[PDB]
């Protein structure tokens, strides 16, 4: 199981720890998509920035 | 009028007015009650004006229960001074009241009398109020 | 001193000061209508400290005048 994570809302104005969560997920630009293994540590950061992000389950 | 006989501290920080009442939200003594719909600091002079209004309507007879007490000192700096130089002097006392509080209760009086007295009393208070009647819901508390 | 019988008159001062005197009023005169006793105080700068002295003196004249009509 994997997660397709798309950054859809800008982190400008959001706390720096949410900005860091994006960095841990490797999301650096709007509309950028990353396919990450579904582990609890990755899921925790995806959930932290859920309001900025669009998630899909893949394969 | 109402104020503490003594206190540990002369002056209190202002604090906040969030939320519904902590307690005192059910009729506990009389047959009818005046319930607060909005939060406010209710002054001792407002309380007394409400009381006197009710005894004036009853003329003779009935019983009033005052369920709020102004124990919070109210502070004001002398007129025309600048900021600083310490906290202003105590000028009065207030009872903190939040939505749902039963502030006054009446008994020993007809429904028409209780409705009218509590209405007049409500006009002396800086908040919106509601008149209620003792219920099984109150008795179950 | 029941106020409904008071006519408070705020105007400008007279004499030493600065721009403050020319602009800031703070000259007070109260008038007790039932007795006709008037008092104006123009000592310190602020009218509130000028009204305080004006109030206490007005009552002092009200009492000294009634105590006259009583011992007369």
């Amino acid at each position: 199981p994997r997660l397709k994570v798309k950054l859809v809302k800008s982190p400008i104005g959001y706390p720096k720890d949410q900005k860091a969560a994006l960095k841990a997920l490797g999301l650096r630009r709007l509309q950028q998509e990353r396919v990450l293994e579904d582990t609890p540590a990755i899921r925790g950061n995806v959930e932290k920035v859920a309001h900025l992000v669009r998630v899909e389950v893949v394969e | 009028m109402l104020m503490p006989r003594r206190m540990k501290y002369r002056k209190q920080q202002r604090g906040r007015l969030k939320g519904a009442t902590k307690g005192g939200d059910y009729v506990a003594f009389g047959d009818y009650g005046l319930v607060a719909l909005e939060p406010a600091w209710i002054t001792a002079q407002q309380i007394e004006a409400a009381r006197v209004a009710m005894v004036r309507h009853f003329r003779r007879g009935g019983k009033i229960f005052i369920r709020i007490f102004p124990d919070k000192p109210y502070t004001k700096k002398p007129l025309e001074v600048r900021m600083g130089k310490g906290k202003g002097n105590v000028e009065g006392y207030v009872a903190v009241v939040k939505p749902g509080r039963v502030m006054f209760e009446v008994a020993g009086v007809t429904e028409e009398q209780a409705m009218e007295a509590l209405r007049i009393a409500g006009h002396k208070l800086p908040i919106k109020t509601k008149i209620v009647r003792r219920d099984a819901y109150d008795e179950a508390q | 001193i029941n106020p409904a019988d008071l006519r408070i008159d705020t105007f400008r001062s007279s004499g030493a000061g600065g721009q403050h005197v020319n602009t800031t009023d703070s000259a007070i005169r109260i008038t007790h209508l039932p007795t006709g006793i008037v008092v104006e105080c123009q000592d310190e700068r602020s009218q509130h400290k000028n009204k305080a002295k004006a109030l206490s003196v007005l009552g002092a004249r009200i009492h000294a005048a009634e105590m006259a009509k009583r011992q007369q």
């Binding site: - | 002398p78 001074v81 130089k85 310490g86 | -």
Partner: protein, 77 residues
């Protein structure tokens, strides 16, 4: 108008300095406290100001003994 208050003393930075499961060396201060809010347990000494400190190299362990108080122990490694 003036104030007769305006005083306060320096903050004393009290509290637990090493939590349960931390690897300490002998002498490591474990708790700064006023009185015995924590009591010295196995391999833990107490100084004249109630400071708890490790007597041996080891691992910190806490224990709540009800009416007997809370204790701080060091478990040798």
């Amino acid at each position: 108008g003036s104030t007769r208050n305006g005083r306060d003393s320096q903050a004393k930075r009290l509290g637990v300095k090493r939590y349960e499961g931390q690897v300490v060396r002998a002498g490591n201060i474990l708790v700064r406290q006023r009185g015995t809010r924590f009591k010295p347990g196995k391999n833990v000494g107490m100084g004249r100001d109630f400071t708890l400190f490790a007597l041996v190299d080891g691992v910190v362990e806490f224990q709540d003994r009800g009416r007997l108080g809370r204790y701080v122990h060091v478990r040798p490694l």
